[PDB]
Amino acid sequence: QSGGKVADYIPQLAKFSPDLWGVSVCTVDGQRHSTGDTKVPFCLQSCVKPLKYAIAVNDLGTEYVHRYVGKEPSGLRFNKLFLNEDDKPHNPMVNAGAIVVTSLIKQGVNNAEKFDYVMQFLNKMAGNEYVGFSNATFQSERESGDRNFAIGYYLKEKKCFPEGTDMVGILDFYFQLCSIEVTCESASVMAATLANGGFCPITGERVLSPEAVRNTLSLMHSCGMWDFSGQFAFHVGLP
Amino acid sequence: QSGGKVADYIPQLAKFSPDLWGVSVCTVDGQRHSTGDTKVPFCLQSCVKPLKYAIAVNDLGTEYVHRYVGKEPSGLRFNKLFLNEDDKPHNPMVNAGAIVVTSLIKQGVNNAEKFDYVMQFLNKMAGNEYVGFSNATFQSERESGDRNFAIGYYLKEKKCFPEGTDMVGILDFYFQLCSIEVTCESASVMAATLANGGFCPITGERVLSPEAVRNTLSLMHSCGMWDFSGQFAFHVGLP
Amino acid sequence: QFLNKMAGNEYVGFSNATFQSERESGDRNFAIGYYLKEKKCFPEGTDMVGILDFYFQLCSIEVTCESASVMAATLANGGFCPITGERVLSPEAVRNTLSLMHSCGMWDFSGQFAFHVGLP
Amino acid sequence: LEDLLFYTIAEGQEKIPVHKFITALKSTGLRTSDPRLKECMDMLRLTLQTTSDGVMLDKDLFKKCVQSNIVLLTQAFRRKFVIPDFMSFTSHIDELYESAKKQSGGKVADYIPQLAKFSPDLWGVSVCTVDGQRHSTGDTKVPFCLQSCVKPLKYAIAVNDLGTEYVHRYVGKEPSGLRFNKLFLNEDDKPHNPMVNAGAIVVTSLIKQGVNNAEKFDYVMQFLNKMAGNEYVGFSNATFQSERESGDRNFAIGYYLKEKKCFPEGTDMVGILDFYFQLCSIEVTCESASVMAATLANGGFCPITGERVLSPEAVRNTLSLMHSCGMWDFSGQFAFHVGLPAKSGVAGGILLVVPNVMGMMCWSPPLDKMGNSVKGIHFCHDLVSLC
Ligand SMILES: NC(=O)CC[C@H](N)C(=O)O
């Protein structure tokens, strides 16, 4: 297959060649295998949202997490800015829900220790694999991502944020979470910890509560593919 | 629980008592059990749509069925009048998709044989149980149902109908299909034929193809509960 | 300076108290500005944040009713100040802004205002 | 010519096992992950699955297979490298490591609270030579930030890209004699040298002035990766979120420089300051940083790749600047006792350079009151006293 249309916005993402292709496999027990360009690092744009939702749930309880976000598919593009009948984001998967669930994690703590905590937790989840940070793609999407700023200002205007929260710092933190880079082999440990009962497939450590894993699996099955989620559940039927 | 708000439109449907409540259960093997007032007949409004979708798929092939209807959730009420980017209904569960899939079932033959055909399939699925027809709720919702007429005329204006199809007759046939009434015990035989691989749990015969059963099960799991489908999959996770 | 020329050197102040507010609390305007920046409907080489702050400053100007009586009177004339008689606005600009105020100068109430009052 | 050295490795037998071939290769100090011998390494890999003998290499296969690395292997296996008897050198390094482990020091980090989380007993030393010999001990695999140790590197980048006259049009080349946090300029209202914070800010203001930060960081990271031989050059975002909400002396210095109008025309101070924080937030390991200070120990040529990175003029200029004022107020004492071009930082790293011989890296989170690691200074003193 050929496809095309790599990336127009975020010009740092457009520098990748279109013929890059790699697939990594890791099972629950530890059986792993990879082919292609699996050693090349790449960013984790929008793929960290189920992970950060799991972190927020495991830290704060699902009722307190869903006090501010819904659990329904939006039915439109993730860039489209609108709320439900209750003036809330539709799901954590879309940009508004991602911003709100970034607001929940460690509300009384500054950005540096928040990033340190989430990076330590994700490294524990990854079995101390390679988890980097592409600062080149963080300088981009910050000076060029304008739709996310509009969504954040709309959410601040609708007063859907938790009290005593700065919108600009939370949006920058969300950009930092989106700017995390992993390889395909390192991301094979991802989607395997939550494929298990919250335990790491390699180290066997206790990482996530089973409730958080079940909730994020249900959310990925429901609206984990934007408008293509219905067709994906119809044909593939996998989270 | 109490609830409230029985039915505003379809004034024939508003005559039911608010404390009326019963549950019937039937399994794949054949054993069944029911409690309460299960013998009382009631209309199958908006519940026959997975059944008619299964009939249409089993008779026409899923590619020809989905040539006109998409397979994505809408995210809004079933009475809402809008289409997707491709000027098509989002899914067969909403009213527009139901109208389009009723337009496909035996398009070359008039209503008199079409109703007999779908009633024969419904009786074969039900194992010759009670499948009645509440004419009182068919005379109502035809003189008072106005949103369906607007939706059908919008679909005709968008030219999403098959060639050589009358809008008014197909809409009347859709009303007739929605006006079919069954009891709780009789409807318990339904949703068990498609719980099996298309085989009737009572007669042991074959009714539906496994592909049609899988397709309608996936669609009902995805967007079979309107805007509450996401919450239903989150909490219950059953079609 | 030009608005003072239009006002005939009347009282035109600047309420800084209402400028500090609506800057830390006006969030819908920021969303609109970022949406316009995302849609690329700005002139080339223009900073969105500074332009939005300038727009807030223009909205933060304060005048009295007597000073605002000279307002809507230079443009009620042929662009000349009713008091000083100086050349202020070109007649084309006055005609265009009068037509725009007559058309959509009252938000959703503009149609009813033109139906009943029928004045810009 | 490879046959005689292969027979010298051999004891008379024509067939030599691969286990014997990898034996004593570590004695030569050349690691197996060198891209120069990546042809030979890929040869060994492909012959390991397909040999039909089991762990064998044979003379004639070695003769026919090696087609581009004859010179390097001949220089390596006849002890033609600049540092012979590498076992004695590693024993000396281990003895100095054991001697330096006795000291305690203290005062790890007060400001940048993310930097204060490091263990005070962490200690590691990495060594790399010009030819390609390398050896590391201790905690050499732990990543750490390159705070103030990237300033000679960015100065070399700026000089190599802009010319020394254009670089020094804005920055002087004299030591200051005070701390790097001190806010003052020279008689001509210019930063004293690129090593202190003001000079670092001004030289970050010069690199690709017409391009935004997104491509500037990619450019400097490409140069750093070419210098490091595609080793681990990461980015610690945790220490970049800190030192931005808590680093106030740098903001005051930047505003003072903006007031003095020493910046190039059409430059935004805040963006350049953020880019400077990003440049100082780059993290590396001791092994990865050992590849650095060896490219500039050579004539701008990377010891691992063998390619060309920097002009010799830039290398000479940054070596002279590191020799002159590479240790803040301790530069005079360091030249008096050690007399080698080295650069320190608030992280704890020491970029000790021996010109045309070998490069080093010493990591110690505890710091002196002046701004240098106590263990690294003691290690350098013991090294210059012994060898
Ligand atoms: N040694 C250093 O000062 C490192 C530079 C760093 N930006 C700081 O101001 O701390």
Author numbering:
A (entry chain A), B (entry chain B): 241 to 479
C (entry chain C): 360 to 479
D (entry chain G): 139 to 525
From the paper:
All glutaminase enzymes share a catalytic domain containing identical active site residues and a conserved mechanism for hydrolyzing glutamine to glutamate. Here we demonstrate that the ability of GAC and GLS2 to form filaments is directly coupled to their catalytic activity and present their cryo-EM structures which provide a view of the conformational states essential for catalysis. Filament formation guides an ‘activation loop’ to assume a specific conformation that works together with a ‘lid’ to close over the active site and position glutamine for nucleophilic attack by an essential serine.
Therefore, we tested this prediction by taking advantage of our earlier finding that substituting an essential tyrosine residue within the enzyme active site of GAC does not disrupt substrate (glutamine) binding but prevents its hydrolysis to glutamate. We determined a 3.3 Å cryo-EM structure of the human GAC (Y466W) mutant which because it is defective for hydrolyzing glutamine to glutamate, assembled into a stable filament upon binding substrate and the anionic activator phosphate (Pi). In both the GAC and GLS2 filament structures, each tetramer interacts with its immediate neighbor through an interface of six alpha helices on the lateral side of the catalytic domain near the lid loop that closes over the substrate binding site. In solving the cryo-EM structure for the GAC(Y466W) filament in the presence of glutamine and Pi, we were able to identify the Pi binding site within the dimer-dimer interface of each tetrameric unit where it interacts with Lys320 and thereby stabilizes the activation loop. However, in the filament structure of GAC, Pi interacts with Arg387, enabling it to form a salt bridge with Glu397 at the dimer-dimer interface, which together with the interactions of Pi with Tyr394 and Lys398, may be necessary for the glutaminase enzymes to undergo the dimer-to-tetramer transition, a prerequisite for filament formation and catalytic activity. Thus, the activation loops of each dimer within the filament fold in a compact manner, thereby bringing Phe318 of GAC (Tyr251 of GLS2) from each loop closer to the active site. However, in the case of the GAC (Y466W) mutant, which binds Pi and substrate but cannot undergo catalysis, the filament persists and now the density of the lid loop within the terminal tetramer of the cryo-EM reconstruction remains intact.
